[PDB]
Amino acid sequence: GTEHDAMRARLVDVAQAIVEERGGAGLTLSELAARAGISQANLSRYFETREDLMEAIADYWFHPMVEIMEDVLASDLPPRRKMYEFFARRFVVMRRKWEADPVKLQTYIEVGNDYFEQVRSYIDLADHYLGEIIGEAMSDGAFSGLEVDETISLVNQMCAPYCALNTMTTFMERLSEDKLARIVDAVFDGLSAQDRGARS
């Protein structure tokens, strides 16, 4: 029932942790069982085959980040607050991983990129949710003259170190919640279709 599905989700979480510890390859049903405190026979009740475990870890890889985005969009926060939290909450989790072990963040990025369907789905879903925020912001009068698609691109290009994991890795020591707050304020109060002299 729900206790079974709660346990399966808990096992997938332990499996993701082992993958990160090992630097990618080396996950076995043997070690998962040993780490989870269950037997190999009991583990097969949750993962019938090794392949099912491998599928589960791939499907769950970016799920924690998806949940964070879903929670932010489901909140009652105004668009500016939503945009900040949309990036900030994910940044905080990734920074924590890097603070504990920079190699675990490296592994997280490397493994994630090998999961074709999942990483592409995640990136696409992220843009979809960013669009929902931008659309509401526009009804409030922000981003005057811009289309949602071009604004999604502009925001992704202005917030890259707080979102794109390879950029985040490069900039990590210089990143902060204080700086991201400044950026989001600058996006909201500075981004529009009105040419203001950058080129003329």
Distance CA 97, CA 104 (A): 7
Q: CA 66, CA 2: separation in Å to the nearest integer?
A: 21
153 near Cl ion (CB under 5 A): yes
x/- track of binding to a second copy for residues 146-165 (CB under 8 A):
----x--xx--xxxxxx-x-
Binding of residue 28 to Cl ion (CB under 5 A):
no
Q: What is the DSSP letter of 141?
A: T
Interface of this chain with a second copy, residues 89 to 148, rule: CB under 8 A: none
Judge contact between 187 and 130, C-beta under 8 A: no
Q: How far apart are CA 164 and CA 104, in angstroms?
A: 16
CB of 172 to a second copy, least distance (A): 11
CA separation for the pair 35, 51 (Å, rounded)? 19
Stretch that binds Cl ion, among 4-12, 37-45, 65-73, 172-180 (CB under 5 A): 172-180
Residues that bind a second copy in the complex, under the rule CB under 8 A: 78, 80-81, 83-84, 150, 153-154, 157-162, 164, 166-167, 170-171, 174-175, 177, 179-192, 194-200
Residues that bind Cl ion in the complex, under the rule CB under 5 A: 153, 156, 174
